[PDB]
Design a protein around this ligand. Structure first.
Ligand SMILES: CCCCCCCCCCCCCC(=O)O[C@H](CCCCCCCCCCC)CC(=O)O[C@@H]1[C@@H](NC(=O)C[C@@H](CCCCCCCCCCC)OC(=O)CCCCCCCCCCC)[C@H](OC[C@H]2O[C@H](OP(=O)(O)O)[C@H](NC(=O)C[C@H](O)CCCCCCCCCCC)[C@@H](OC(=O)C[C@H](O)CCCCCCCCCCC)[C@@H]2O)O[C@H](CO[C@]2(C(=O)O)C[C@@H](O[C@]3(C(=O)O)C[C@@H](O)[C@@H](O)[C@@H]([C@H](O)CO)O3)[C@@H](O)[C@@H]([C@H](O)CO)O2)[C@H]1OP(=O)(O)O
Ligand SMILES: Cc1c(/C=C/C(=O)O)ccc2ccc(O[C@@H](C)c3c(Cl)ccc(F)c3Cl)cc12
Ligand SMILES: Cc1c(/C=C/C(=O)O)ccc2ccc(O[C@@H](C)c3c(Cl)ccc(F)c3Cl)cc12
Lengths: 575, 565
């Protein structure tokens, strides 16, 4: 199962890697020469013992130290080169994975974000994309280098004492099965301790975060005894974790030791020790010893690699997720702003009570309409629907054509959102007022935008004034100032359809007559949809609609609904 | 001086277990000795086994190797188990100590530091200390035994070559020094992605996909460059070090050529001498880096002694109250958060007559929440006096005082356990499951509990991954209801009001607030208008108050405040 899953996942990833195939190829050749350094250095023992102590000083003297120094230079160079090439390929593929995930997540449905913590996604894309590369790199390096060295060593063993090698080979399958069984018995118990440590973490974190309810409700004994239990289980699982390998390693090298001691017990018998010499035994047996590390490394590569692909899969699924549905094909430059809800009903995902039902309303160009009604109702939902954050279930919302006929980009350039909870990207004030159009709007343009939004009183108080850096997640700006900055954005862009949210707005602003003048100047021109909560806007609004339980129950003018004096006057009395 | 004083402050926690350390130490000694005895055997094999003596190649070697390997494996297993046992015991003792102590600290301690930082103190630092110190001990003993076991063999089998190597060791040391000396962007990646996911709403309108894509491009590529840089630096270091060592060894071998030397050497003598020289390269590497790891361990440990030496909140109150159906009163209370010098609360006087619900409204940042924080004595005041039943809150022992208050807030933490057990938190045995279940429906929390797979015995699993914002709130109400606490503190600033079933929560509050003292940081219109007294807070002071004939018109701020929300 999992070999197949991991291999299809890998064939998915190879497109991302193939552009850096040159780096891969180079690293591989360097690894080959690296393994040959070691092979050719172990060969150097034969001429040393036989000739250099068969009465010849030239060997030990002139060249042997020279060749060793040169081989070590070669080893170091192959080492550094392979290291660098692999680290380069990995850096590239990791960064590529990350740009893919970022670009994709940016284009996801809003439902995807309100539901998931920003963190989990952020953490996964930084950690997993690095792990895929680490595991893949290690696996490749192992196969190449150590599979080259086992070849070198097997051939050398066969040239020097063709006989002894086969005794090792015939022993190989049963030794392999023995080692594999011993390995599978004990060492495969990381997740046990991962669970237990997750419990340690959970207890500690619940106590630290919920410190205040522990204090009020007096659960110190409960939390304590709980930690006493889980920490001891964590201890015991750490000890079982070590015991696994403490038991499995000596056993395994003992098995290999038996195989080698049999080979050596044949070294004493006459048929083969006659042809051979004291220098050949040395190189052959040292080859066999050297082989133990490559064999160990190679028989764990599937573990390493399948792990890498198991993380690559969690990245791939995020990529496979469905992005925002966008099939408009219609584009509009500077819409007029004639927005009409016809028979709109809509229920948020997962819920079972519609946030809106049979909603019918009409907003003509250049004029405003206030959505007042019991807090918690669907006026906010109405606002959210015009931007296609959520697709209605039944009916149709028209802009001049159904919103879903329009490209999301074109549809969204028509809409300007002014609320207190606007996001302040950490950057200059000017670049926050001209978020994604720094190239299109002049400095004087931005200056006048901020002036007309009655924001310059608190900008001129900044450190560098208008070029001061707001952000750092918005500490430097209060809400009454965030509103005016949002208003500056909207004035600059001069979008044809405004969505104004005074719900979250703070009317407790030392400067709110200025916020009111900014709004008056903002909405002179264009269609406006206010989730109203101010005396000023409901005073000047062209139409007031009263919403409860996702239904429009009364429509009319302020004065006409007070002459009427029905539900609107009930709200008037209440607020 | 500090690096060792910290270890001696720590040694008391370890000394109960020195019994394992010494056993591990002997095992390490014998392990080094086994590895040395095999290099010893190297000479008999060659010389004797091919001084025309199959006696050695059949008898000596095949069985002595197996014996030595058995001993090696057992010494390894034993030292492993001993060190692991002691290390587990100390990390357990220390994690338990830190959990208890941190829990006993005041809220002033938690405001400064992140919760995740304090969690790291328990999960990692406490393990890193024992890790680094265990590794220090093992390196010291094991490799300090191997180094001498090898040096002896070296000088014995050929004093000539060995002194030649020793005379070179100083220069080699200085050289490896000079090169091992030559041995933010991640924050920008996490930030560039996090403030994208934050402003996804603002990125979709204004069309900020392009500018964000290229911002990321920049940041990601910059960290890729940094990440390659570090590995390149690390990579080059060791090749050069191996080259240096190999130079010295090649010179030694050029020396073995001279006839005065070679004559002493045999096929086996030189073999084992150079074998031990090479083996010595890993003891030396380990023995030069050991004090660095001890340093980092003891630094992590003095971090935790900084935590342990901090003081737990003060509970000198010797007064107990079984239960207090009584009023809480603020008498000219003034407060300033430690570290700030502008009082969050100036001269304040506030009465919450028993049974009555006093709803206090105030601007989001104001000291309205500070009041409810003061009643439970999360912080002590600077001037004034808070009386519960006409006696200073500080007169009481904190346990009794907090038994009288129940907190209800959306963000109330739900601890990984059964729904039922969360409702009877810290008093699971006291209340019968009938009491619990009644408390559950009385809070309208049952509408969603039976939907759960095991209902009331379903466990909130994986740090609270199951429940909704609005569900936690009804569970908190159930907890306070069941406990039936005289003083109700109801936090509605964190409430998250827009929910699927808010009428349920509202009626739950209706039931809870009734015939019970309630002090609510109110945002809801309903809990406000049907409250006994409304109290406005502006900055550190109270501006104006009002009942039901005054709720009609307030002199101060209430008009605009009510108009905003
Ligand atoms: C003799 C001999 O072989 O010398 C050879 C000469 C050949 C003739 C040279 C070697 O050097 C190379 C060897 N391979 C060759 O082809 C030549 C290789 O062999 C490893 C063996 O391990 C056993 O452990 P034990 O001592 O038995 O416990 C020892 N016993 C045997 O082999 C018995 C056998 O019967 C022979 C034995 O030593 C000995 O005792 C020798 C002694 O027995 C001989 C006497 C009998 C020897 O050391 O070591 C790597 C270095 O490994 C990295 C690396 O660069 O790959 C991997 C890294 O692995 C770990 C780790 O072990 O710490 C894994 C951990 O899980 C992890 O926590 C950490 C890290 O994550 C922490 O952050 O790294 C670590 O080893 C590191 C070290 O430098 C210091 O960390 O280097 C060297 O590669 P190279 O640099 O490319 O050449
Ligand atoms: C020692 C060893 C490990 C290592 C596992 C670990 O260290 O965890 C892993 C896989 C192996 C597969 C075959 C095998 O066959 C023996 C006959 C053999 C060969 Cl073919 C060559 C040289 C030898 F020395 C031996 Cl003994 C030994 C193996
Ligand atoms: C190889 C090595 C490391 C390791 C550094 C690293 O790996 O980072 C660290 C410190 C050293 C100090 C002296 C030294 O002297 C050489 C001549 C020597 C001796 Cl005295 C004994 C046996 C030998 F095999 C060698 Cl070569 C070598 C050292």
């Amino acid at each position: 199962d999992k070999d197949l899953s991991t291999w299809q996942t890998f064939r998915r990833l190879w497109p991302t890697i193939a552009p850096f195939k040159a780096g891969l190829i180079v690293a591989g050749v360097a690894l080959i020469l690296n393994a040959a350094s070691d092979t050719f250095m172990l060969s150097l023992l034969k001429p040393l013992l036989d000739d250099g102590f068969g009465k010849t000083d030239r060997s030990v003297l002139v060249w042997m130290p020279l060749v060793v120094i040169g081989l070590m230079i070669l080893r170091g160079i192959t080492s550094y080169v392979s290291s660098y090439c692999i680290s380069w390929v990995s850096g590239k593929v990791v960064m590529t994975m990350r740009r893919r995930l970022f670009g994709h997540m940016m284009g996801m449905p809003v439902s995807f974000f309100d539901k998931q913590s920003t963190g989990t996604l952020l953490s996964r894309i930084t950690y997993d994309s690095e792990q895929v590369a680490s595991s893949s790199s290690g696996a490749l390096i192992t196969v190449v280098r150590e599979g080259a060295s086992i070849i070198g060593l097997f051939i050398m063993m066969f040239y020097y004492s063709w006989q002894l090698s086969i005794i090792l080979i015939v022993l190989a399958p049963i030794v392999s099965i023995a080692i594999r069984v011993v390995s599978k018995r004990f060492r495969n118990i990381s997740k046990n301790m991962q669970n237990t440590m997750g419990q340690v973490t959970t207890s500690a974190e619940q106590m630290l975060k919920g410190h205040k309810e522990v204090l009020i409700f007096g659960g110190q004994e409960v939390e304590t005894k709980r930690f006493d239990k889980v920490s001891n289980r964590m201890r015991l699982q750490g000890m079982k974790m070590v015991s696994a390998s403490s038991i499995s390693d000596p056993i395994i090298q003992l098995i290999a030791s038996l195989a080698l001691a049999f080979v050596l017990y044949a070294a004493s018998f006459p048929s083969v020790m006659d042809s051979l010499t004291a220098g050949t035994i040395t190189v052959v047996f040292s080859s066999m010893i050297a082989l133990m590390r490559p064999l160990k490394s190679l028989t764990n590569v599937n573990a390493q690699f399948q792990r890498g692909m198991a993380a690559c899969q969690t990245l791939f699924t995020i990529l496979d997720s469905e992005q925002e549905k966008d099939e408009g094909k219609r584009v509009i430059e500077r819409a007029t702003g004639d927005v009409e809800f016809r028979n709109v009903t809509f229920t948020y995902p997962g819920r079972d009570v519609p946030a809106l039902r049979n909603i019918n309303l009409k907003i003509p160009a250049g004029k405003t309409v206030a959505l007042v009604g019991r807090s918690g109702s669907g006026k906010s939902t109405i606002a959210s629907l015009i931007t296609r954050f959520y697709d209605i279930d039944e009916g149709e919302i028209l802009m001049d054509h159904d919103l879903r006929e329009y490209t999301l980009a074109s549809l969204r350039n028509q809409v300007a959102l002014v609320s207190q909870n606007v996001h302040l990207f950490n950057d200059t004030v000017a670049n926050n007022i001209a978020y994604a159009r720094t190239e299109q709007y002049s400095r004087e343009q931005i200056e006048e935008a901020a002036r007309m939004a009655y924001a310059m009183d608190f900008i001129n108080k900044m450190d560098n004034g208008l070029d001061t850096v707001i952000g750092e997640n918005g500490v430097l700006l209060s809400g009454g100032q965030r509103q005016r900055i949002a208003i500056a954005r909207a004035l600059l862009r001069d979008s044809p359809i405004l969505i104004l949210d005074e719900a979250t707005s703070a009317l407790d602003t030392e400067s709110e007559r200025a916020i009111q003048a900014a709004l008056d100047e903002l909405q002179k021109n264009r269609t406006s949809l206010v989730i109203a909560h101010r005396l000023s806007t409901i005073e000047k609004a062209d139409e007031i609609v009263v919403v409860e339980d996702g239904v429009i129950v009364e429509r009319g003018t302020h004065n006409d609904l007070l002459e009427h004096r029905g539900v609107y006057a009930q709200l008037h009395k209440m607020q």
